[PDB]
Write a protein that holds these residues in place. Sequence first.
Motif, short mmCIF file in Angstrom:
data_model
loop_
_atom_site.label_atom_id
_atom_site.label_comp_id
_atom_site.label_asym_id
_atom_site.label_seq_id
_atom_site.Cartn_x
_atom_site.Cartn_y
_atom_site.Cartn_z
N UNK A 147 0.65 5.11 -2.10
CA UNK A 147 1.69 5.11 -1.09
C UNK A 147 1.18 5.84 0.13
N UNK A 148 1.50 5.29 1.30
CA UNK A 148 1.24 5.93 2.59
C UNK A 148 2.53 5.87 3.39
N UNK B 132 4.57 2.28 2.94
CA UNK B 132 4.09 1.09 2.25
C UNK B 132 3.33 1.48 1.00
N UNK B 133 3.37 0.60 0.00
CA UNK B 133 2.89 0.83 -1.36
C UNK B 133 1.84 -0.21 -1.74
#
Lengths: 99, 276, 10
Positions: B97-98, B115-116
Motif C-alpha cells: 500500500x502507498x 492504492x494497493x
Amino acid sequence: IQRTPKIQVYSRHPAENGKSNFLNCYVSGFHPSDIEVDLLKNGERIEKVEHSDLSFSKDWSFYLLYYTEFTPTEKDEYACRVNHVTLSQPKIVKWDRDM
Amino acid sequence: GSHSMRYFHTSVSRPGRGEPRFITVGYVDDTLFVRFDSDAASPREEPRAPWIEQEGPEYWDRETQICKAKAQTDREDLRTLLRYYNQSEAGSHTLQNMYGCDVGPDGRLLRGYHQDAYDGKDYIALNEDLSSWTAADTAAQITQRKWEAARVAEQLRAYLEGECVEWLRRYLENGKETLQRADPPKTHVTHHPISDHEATLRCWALGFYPAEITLTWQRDGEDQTQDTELVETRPAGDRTFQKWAAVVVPSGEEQRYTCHVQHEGLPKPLTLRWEP
Amino acid sequence: RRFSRSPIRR
C-alpha cells in the motif's frame, strides 16, 4: 508473477586507491521481495554489510541498497552476489570503477 | 518547488515461519524520515531524518500505534485475500500500500493517492477525485463494495486534503535546510575504447538531489534514445543520487556527440562533450 | 504524519 532484479555495483564517491569509501549494491525492479545479497571481496563474503529498509517503486517492484565501508586498491576485486527466485543460480556482478 | 509526502507499506506472509513481516517507510520527496519493521527487536516507529527527531514522545507513540494497527489489519487482509483468490495457505503472498499527497510551491494540494497491490499486481486504487475507486478484478471489487459501504474514500479525502498537507507543510519548514535545497549534478564525460573502431562515451551525473533527472545523448543534434544505455538512477547512500548514460561511438566521431543534463538544481540545462 | 482513522479491512 515474478520480476528479476536489476543489479548495480558502484562506489559512493569516485574511487581513489587508498581512500576510504562506500561499496554499494543496488537491487531493484524485482518481485517477490525475498532476495539474498552479498558483497564480495576477492570472492569472499564481506561480513558486516547493512541494507536499507524495503521499499518499492510506482510499478510496485521492490528495491534495496546493500552497502559497506571499503578502501579500494589496484588489486582487490569487489563484487555483488544476488540470489532470487527468478535466478537459476546466484548472479555475480563485478565492481568496475568505470560504471 | 513542488513536494510530496508518501507512506509505503509491505506485508509478506511466510507460512511456517511465524506471522507476516511488516515494513513501512515514510518519505518527504526522496528523503526517508520514518520507518517501522515488525521484525525489529522492539518494534517502534523510528526517526530517519534529523528534522523529525524534534517531534515529541506523543508523536512517536501515536505513529507506533498506527503502524502496529496497520500490521494487524494487513495480517487479516492477507487471510481474506487467500479466500478472494481461492489460494492455498502454503505459499507466501504480498500486500503493498502507498498513500500520500503532492503539493505545489504554494503548499496547495496538487493531488492525493491511496492504492494497493496484491502479489505485485494492482489491486484497488483511490481515483484522483479522492471519491471513487478503480478495482483491478472481481476480488478487488469485493473490497470496493465494502469500502463504498463504509465511506472509506471520504475518510481518506479528509486526511489527504487535511493532515497530509498540513504536516507535509510543517515538515518542509522544520527541515528546510535539506528538504528545500536541490543539489545539482556534478557532471563529466568519460571515454572507453572498445576496439580499433569504437569507444564508449559515458556521461556521468553524480551527487544530485532530488532523484529526478534527465540525461540524454545527441548525435548531430539528433536524440540517440534507441542507442543510449541509460542505467536506473541509484542512491549513493548519503542522500544524493547517481546516473549515467552511455553511447558507443565510432572512432574519430566523438565531437558529434553531446550529453544533455536537466535537473532542478540547474538554472539552465547543461551541454557537455568528451574533453580529451 | 500517518492516516490514523480506524483501519478498514479489505
